[PDB]
């Protein structure tokens, strides 16, 4: 995937799971609620 190409510690899986969604959020950013909610919408 793009996760193991980017190094690998087991507790570095966050790249597989939540990093892109989060990066996708900040660029948008305006209280935290904008991100807090957008963090729910994708899933």
């Amino acid at each position: 995937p793009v996760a193991m190409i980017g190094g690998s510690t087991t507790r570095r899986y966050l790249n597989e799971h939540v990093t892109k969604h989060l990066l996708e959020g900040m660029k948008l950013i305006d209280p935290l609620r904008v991100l807090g909610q957008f963090l729910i919408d994708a899933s």
Binding site: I5, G6, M26
Partner: protein
């Protein structure tokens, strides 16, 4: 101004593949203790000349930045980047040591202890009367060439007598005990929280900006000390390729004077101490006392980066007194003439862990650190 180094074919890895892109280093057989092979790394750049290194991998998710820090091992363990080239290690049990003909050498854990209460244990494997070891704690300024404690950047305890070592001097403050080849020594390191450590440093900044400025250029330095955010992280990293491997090269801290301040109220020079900081050593669960209480603080002007002030002074600008998310105390281990010892990180393999819910195993703060790394990798892109 400067572009990121290109991608290359051995960086790309697709789904079907199973190779692990933290490309492990090539080792060299160094010596043997107790019928176990200890290896040194042969062609990875080790921390030296005030530069620290960390293996990085290709992260296509970042377009501005192209590479992000990754770690070699699955769990927490020694940072193979800051050792002496002659400090070997065994992948079987992660014990470390130097050959029986070598002087003092040191290694630091890969996790940086910033605040809270952290517990772990040292397992000693081979400590004869010719093979000594020293378990202790150190900041980034300490040199892995010297045994932890010979400078004021480190705190350690000796193997024979369990004496205490700081600034190179010995003290018998802890309950005497001489380590045998199977003990398990505990270390509970309590530090104040970052907010309380942050003002202790902003105050130190503010005292130093003008009181000691009423060296030729006061103006520029004062600008630097005002523009000093200790909590917020500004990191300096450039991706380089060293012998077809991929590492991040960052600037590191240098030794300086020991911070002092004159207190008009008591009318005497006082040293700087972290509030309520404590370093308690255990022997098989049973405490032998507090090693230190007044641990020096490290957050911003307490720790100065490597700095080409000749360049920035001429002139958009960087800071000496900046945090790169690697400020704190690393569990340091030192070996002398075959003295070997191991460092434990995960709860499941601690024999005598104290029961408190706020304390965290080194693996926990490791995990807490990786998360803090990738987030900080995130912001820098933007």
């Amino acid at each position: 101004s400067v572009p990121v180094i290109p991608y290359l074919d051995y960086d790309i890895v697709d789904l079907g593949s199973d190779i692990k892109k933290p490309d492990f280093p090539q080792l060299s057989e160094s010596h043997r203790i107790n019928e176990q092979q200890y290896y040194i790394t042969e062609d990875t750049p080790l921390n030296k000349r005030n530069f620290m290194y960390q293996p990085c991998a290709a992260n296509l998710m970042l377009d501005k930045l192209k590479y992000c820090g990754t770690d070699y091992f699955d769990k927490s363990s020694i940072n193979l980047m800051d050792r002496s080239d002659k400090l070997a290690f065994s992948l079987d049990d992660h014990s470390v040591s130097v050959s029986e003909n070598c002087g003092w050498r040191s290694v630091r854990s890969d996790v940086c202890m910033k605040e809270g209460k952290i517990y772990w244990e040292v397992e000693v494997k081979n400590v004869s009367d010719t093979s000594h070891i020293r378990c202790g704690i150190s900041r980034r300024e300490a040199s892995t060439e010297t045994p932890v404690g010979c400078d004021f950047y480190g705190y350690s305890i000796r193997d024979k007598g369990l004496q205490v070592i700081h600034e190179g001097r010995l003290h018998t403050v802890l309950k005497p005990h001489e380590m045998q080849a199977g003990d398990r020594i505990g270390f509970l390191l309590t530090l104040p929280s970052l907010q309380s450590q942050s003002e202790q440093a902003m105050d130190y900044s503010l005292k130093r900006i003008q009181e000691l400025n009423n060296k030729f250029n006061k103006e520029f330095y004062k600008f630097l000390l005002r523009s000093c955010e200790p909590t917020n992280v500004v990191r300096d990293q450039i991706a380089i390729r060293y012998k077809n491997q991929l590492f991040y090269e960052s600037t590191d801290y240098v030794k300086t004077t020991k911070p002092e301040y004159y207190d008009n109220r008591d009318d005497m020079q006082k040293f700087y101490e972290l509030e309520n900081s404590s370093f308690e050593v255990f022997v098989n669960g049973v405490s032998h006392g507090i090693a230190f209480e007044g641990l020096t603080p490290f957050l911003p002007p307490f720790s100065e980066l490597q700095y080409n002030e000749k360049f920035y002074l001429h002139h958009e600008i960087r800071n000496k007194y900046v945090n790169n998310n690697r400020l704190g105390y690393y569990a340091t281990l030192s070996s002398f003439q075959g003295g070997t010892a191991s460092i434990i990180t995960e709860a499941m393999e601690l024999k005598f862990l104290p029961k408190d819910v706020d304390i965290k195993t080194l693996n926990d703060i490791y995990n807490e650190q990786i998360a803090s790394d990738i987030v900080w990798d995130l912001i820098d892109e933007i």
